[PDB]
Amino acid sequence: RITTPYMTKYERARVLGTRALQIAMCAPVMVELEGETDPLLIAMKELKARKIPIIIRRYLPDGSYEDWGVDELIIT
Amino acid sequence: GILFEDIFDVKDIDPEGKKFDRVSRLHCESESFKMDLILDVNIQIYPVDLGDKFRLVIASTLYDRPSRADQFEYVMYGKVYRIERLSAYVSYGGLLMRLQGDANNLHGFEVDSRVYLLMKKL
Amino acid sequence: ETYRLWKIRKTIMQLCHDRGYLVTQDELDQTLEEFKAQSGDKPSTDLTVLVAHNQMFVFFPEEPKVGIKTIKVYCQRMQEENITRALIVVQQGMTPSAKQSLVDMAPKYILEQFLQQELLINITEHELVPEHVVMTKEEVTELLARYKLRENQLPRIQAGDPVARYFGIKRGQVVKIIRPSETAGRYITYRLVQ
Amino acid sequence: KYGINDNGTTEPRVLYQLDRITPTQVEKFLETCRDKYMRAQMEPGSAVGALCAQSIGE
Numbered sequence: 308r309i310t311t312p313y314m315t316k317y318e319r320a321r322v323l324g325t326r327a328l329q330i331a332m333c334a335p336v337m338v339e340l341e342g343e344t345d346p347l348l349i350a351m352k353e354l355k356a357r358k359i360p361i362i363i364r365r366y367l368p369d370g371s372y373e374d375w376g377v378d379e380l381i382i383t
Numbered sequence: 384g385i386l387f388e389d390i391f392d393v394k395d396i397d398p399e400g401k402k403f404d405r406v407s408r409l410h411c412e413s414e415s416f417k418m419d420l421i422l423d424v425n426i427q428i429y430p431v432d433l434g435d436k437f438r439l440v441i442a443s444t445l446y447d448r449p450s451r452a453d454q455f456e457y458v459m460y461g462k463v464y465r466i467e468r469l470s471a472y473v474s475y476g477g478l479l480m481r482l483q484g485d486a487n488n489l490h491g492f493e494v495d496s497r498v499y500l501l502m503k504k505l
Numbered sequence: 506e507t508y509r510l511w512k513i514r515k516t517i518m519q520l521c522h523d524r525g526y527l528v529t530q531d532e533l534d535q536t537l538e539e540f541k542a543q544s545g546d547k548p549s550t551d552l553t554v555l556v557a558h559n560q561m562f563v564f565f566p567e568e569p570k571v572g573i574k575t576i577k578v579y580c581q582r583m584q585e586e587n588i589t590r591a592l593i594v595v596q597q598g599m600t601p602s603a604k605q606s607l608v609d610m611a612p613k614y615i616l617e618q619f620l621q622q623e624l625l626i627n628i629t630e631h632e633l634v635p636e637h638v639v640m641t642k643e644e645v646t647e648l649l650a651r652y653k654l655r656e657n658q659l660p661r662i663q664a665g666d667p668v669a670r671y672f673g674i675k676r677g678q679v680v681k682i683i684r685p686s687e688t689a690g691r692y693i694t695y696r697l698v699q
Numbered sequence: 700k701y702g703i704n705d706n707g708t709t710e711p712r713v714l715y716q717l718d719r720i721t722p723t724q725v726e727k728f729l730e731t732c733r734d735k736y737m738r739a740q741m742e743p744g745s746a747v748g749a750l751c752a753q754s755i756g757e
Binding site for chain 2: 710711712713714716717719
Binding site: 311313316317 | 737738740742743744745
């Protein structure tokens, strides 16, 4: 609950990083897509509709963690 | 519909020296209102000379089908963009107008509003 | 000249006020005229302070290079008065055999050593040196916890640093540094000591 | 200098546009200066020294 409630540019990159690679292995798509064949262009459609089945595990450097749903974050 | 009008006497055709070939910045003085204005005028279309009485009308609207206010012979179009004895800066694309002085008759003005000029020689 | 035999006494009574003793305020600030009572005599030890905590014992041995015997002059009155901490403010420096005599008799009595021209300016009131503040034992435990940091892993200041040697800090203590900025002025950093 | 704000009505109406700061703007001014300050934080995990080595070296 203590880290920044803004999705950083390093979290948006990897969430788009692995949701692209998930959807390029026939994952179920959450956005009823409209002809986009680039898997990366599907993932930004997933982000803006805020439907990504991914929870960011944010590591405080002592070892404790703090989860954050991608629904529960403020993208830019 | 007129915001502001009076008769003006242009006194310096270009105060600090000719900087442009098509636009010279006039310095004028009103008649009995004493509104100084610093107006740029495209002189290739509408040549002006030293000591020339010319009318000046500021209107929010002009009312070829609605039969525009066309008795005047030089019409610009621009917006007011600063109000600083009030100054009242009007910009006509690039042509500035700094109508000044005596804020009781300047009352029609505001900021971010479209403003026509309607000049005429005398 | 006496700008020294006075400002040194001005500095160490700023110094042991910062280290938390009880110097009365009138004894702290002296103009030179308040020290012109003794001013002609000491050029041509009459200067030794004992102050206690809210107890250090400074020394100005008139010998330039303090030898082991000169320490041994007041090794005995160190253990006579049951005083635990001391200061030896020297003129030139210690003899290179005498500095071990401090660390041979290390845990019984402390007796830190300063030079003269090291002490002629108060380095705390220097514009480049920010306000070091020694933190308490409970001030460390609320530091480590907030940052979830082990005692080690803090930024580190040496024990022989000129401001650690000023404030009189053993290993294991943590100073709090208020570095002045321009937007905030309260940029706080901490330092574990080595 | 002029133009008393007795209730916001003087007779020349133009005078209230001298320094207009009307409270729809000043609340949008804060919600922007907050969010411009919150956005321009150091994003966590940003190779902070690797930015420093380029910005001294270049």
